Amino acid sequence: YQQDQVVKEDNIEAVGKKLHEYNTQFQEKSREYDRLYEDYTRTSQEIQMKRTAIEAFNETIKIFEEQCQTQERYSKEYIEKFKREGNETEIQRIMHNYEKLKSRISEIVDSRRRLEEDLKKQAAEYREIDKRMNSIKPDLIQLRKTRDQYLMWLTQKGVRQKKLNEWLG
Amino acid sequence: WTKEENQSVVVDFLLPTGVYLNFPVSRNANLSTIKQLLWHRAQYEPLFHMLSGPEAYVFTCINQTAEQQELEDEQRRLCDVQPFLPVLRLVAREGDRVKKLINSQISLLIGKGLHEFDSLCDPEVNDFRAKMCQFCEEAAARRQQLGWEAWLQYSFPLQLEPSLPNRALLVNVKFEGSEESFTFQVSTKDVPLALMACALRKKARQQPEDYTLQVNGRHEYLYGSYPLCQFQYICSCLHSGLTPHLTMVHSSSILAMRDEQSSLWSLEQPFRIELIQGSKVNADERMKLVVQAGLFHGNEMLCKTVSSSEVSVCSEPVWKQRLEFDINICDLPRMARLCFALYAVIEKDCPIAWANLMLFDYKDQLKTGERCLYMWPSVPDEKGELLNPTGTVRSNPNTDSAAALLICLPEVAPHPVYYPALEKILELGRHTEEEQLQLREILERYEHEKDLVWKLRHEVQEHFPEALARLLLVTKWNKHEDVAQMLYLLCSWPELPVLSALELLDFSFPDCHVGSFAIKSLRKLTDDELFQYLLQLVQVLKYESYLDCELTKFLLDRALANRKIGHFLFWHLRSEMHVPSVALRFGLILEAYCRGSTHHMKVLMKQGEALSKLKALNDFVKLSSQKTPKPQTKELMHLCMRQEAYLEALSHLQSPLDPSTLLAEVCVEQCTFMDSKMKPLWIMYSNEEAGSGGSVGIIFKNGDDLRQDMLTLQMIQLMDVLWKQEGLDLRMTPYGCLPTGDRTGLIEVVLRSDTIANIQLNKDALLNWLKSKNPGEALDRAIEEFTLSCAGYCVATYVLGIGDRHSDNIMIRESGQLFHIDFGHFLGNFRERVPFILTYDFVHVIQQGKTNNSEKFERFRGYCERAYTILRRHGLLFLHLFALMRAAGLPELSCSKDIQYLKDSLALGKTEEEALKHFRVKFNEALRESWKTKV
């Protein structure tokens, strides 16, 4: 007066034939999960690298903003001080050199912008990697339990280890 | 990139007048040369007259880990600096240069910028850094005042054998700077103080306690109250027969090396928590999401595991549920652990993710209010538990993209509540036989037995001190009355031996008072013995709950008193900085260490950069191996090493495998790469200060994970020490192997050796090979060397269950010594019991070429048996050590069944006589199976 029935076949060869199938399907799913988990870790490392590089872009720009603040404060004296004594060379050289600094910042802002786009793209990859992994875990786990139930059935029935080993191969 | 390119780069220069220059310079150009080129160009740009001279300014750049760096050493090449963008700013030289430079170099060295610790805005991080950095800085300053005797002990601690005939062979000695040398006689059992006095008699122009002996070509120093034979170098020289070359060094010269600067129990309301929301969940829209949750103290649960309703799958699921657990607030132990797992289930099983949380914080306070737990992905395993209580407490650092569970602990009182102090715990805590024979029987070898040990807990303290661990597990941690009674006993518990303390460091004993007691019993360790377990102790940090713990303090204490321990502590931590689970914890210890070790920091810097270049060099060889044949790739590998930035980086550094060994000058012609899936580089070295056989090699391996091999070599080394402690030298080769990075390490080349495949393949033949390497009289040494090693490596491989043994991963030295390599699989894996193995070809050599040589074969059987026996006596050491290695997350060492392999292989259940009788039957069937296999 007790019941439990996960095994579909009933003769020893048919069950052992199904043991080989479920084992082969399990190792194939295991390989597919392990392939994805490498991508997950690699993508996680790559995303961290990109996030540090964005901070490095921010910190460089910060240095260029400080150069502009100095240029504006520091130049104030000489532009006015050599307007009387008309050195319009000095002004034109300084302000063009400032325009040369400003123009370089816009290149660095662009390069930062291009990276933020890759990180947004790669963040979306990361989430699809995790989405794919989570739709494989049920199949993987169910295939592990089945493989084990079939082994248990055959062992109880008294099937020799050599016969089990050949099916798991 | 900077690592490879020999071209020029356009660099942005920011002058302190606001002026901006932009011109190309060489990547190989050093910063001193760039400053000259800058000053030559700035002439013809505005505001030049207002600048000071070049020596008034220092270049600043943004380095590879996103931090500003004052580039004070201007002999470095721009390629070596690796600025993020080629941007150099001139700033004022003055300021506190020492702190700024150390912080910079620490960031580049640990592979994590220190700003990232600040960014977290965590009091626990900030307090740890504050406390540990001061403690380390304090030990470093205290070290600096002490004498050259003490400092030589720190810097170059003694390398002695475990440990004796009184024979005499001659010694070569010299002084520093002189060409000439003086060979003279000396016994094996002389004390180094005597040896120096002998050498001091140069002519008779005309004191030995002003000197020490150095093994020339390496940082190894003979000193102290030990005979010449106990030292490794002299012992190595005497066994091989070589003449030891030493060097006298003055006490003044050793100083020249040194002088480089720098209430709650009232709250009987039940524990509950407010589940609110999930974020960034990535699941199949058809299923529905459940959050299972449970409270834990180590392994065992404190109450039943509550669950949530089936809310439908999305990125942003909402629950807003109260979850009420079957335990009071006061009933919670110190180390109570709330453990979550997000699942995906059919409405009416898929573990999505998990996260753990300590209820009390590092300052003893019971947490209150909202917490955003950033979860970890659940990976399915054979023992698929509901929750993961043995997983880490730390948050997932990928806060941008990783899923998270928003929760909220309730406000239990207007005043906050801490866990009570020790004295209040000790207060409510003071309060022949039939039972005596029962307890003896239980402890000399379950629910009935647990309640018995609990009542008799005081008689365990008095008469069974070594059974503390058992008494800890039987304690009911879910009732605070029981907890106090146990902790009361623990505070008056007698000091246990090292072996028992090693058991107490495991994840099963999470309480701080236990952890503190374990470390207390490990302070009696010596540096040599401590080094034998440094790998295991590092892995145990991954079970810690809080950052500031006694095990971190212990390891830092020992690392600052001993430079070798510091060296291998650094690399053990450094080589796992890529792992987000431990990156924060390990990063903070490395930081603390560096601040107490600014001298060794400069040595580790050089090593890190060699490893950095080798990585790039191996990547090139990997690519060219696919593109071109090997001989041309070997040449293109050499041209890349000839580059001055490469050559100087790869030259003149202490070896990471052994800091006493110097790697002076690369032998580019001798350098190559091995034919193997990961294409490991074979790099050869040479130093003119060294003597005979002073031509070291290293193997840089990138792609595979070498932690598995290190553990195996650690355990072979351990066996060799255990065997040497009973006067059995089995001539092992426990070669150097060190993981240094992300799937990256070094392996010590073993000179004068080849694989048994190669010896057999090239022109029965194994015995002929030894004849060529040991002619005439020498051949008998080779066979004994073979037999001793063959015995040790037969036992070693059997115990550890190391399969996949074959001709090309078994090697032999020209001395006759056999040794195994490439330990990728162990404990039966490829699982199943690996039999004991005797090879016919090895037995042929052992018997001196004969069919029957009983006298010899019997001795070999004796060596195998005596070896096997000695390891059984120390069996619990191997279990305890392996049990802590489960922390490391090695695939083949992950559970009790992998530990059970060692129990069965060492036959620890059976008696010594029973075990020896089974070992002989295994030995005998191995002998019988040896004949049938070769045919």
Ligand SMILES: CCn1c(-c2cnc(C)nc2)nc2c(N[C@H]3CCN(C(=O)C4CC4)C3)ncnc21
């Ligand atoms: C003991 C270090 N060690 C290893 C080794 C490699 N990997 C792993 C995981 N462990 C150990 N291998 C050797 C070794 N190999 C010979 C035969 C093939 N060889 C070449 O291909 C080189 C000349 C071009 C040299 N020789 C000496 N020590 C070695």
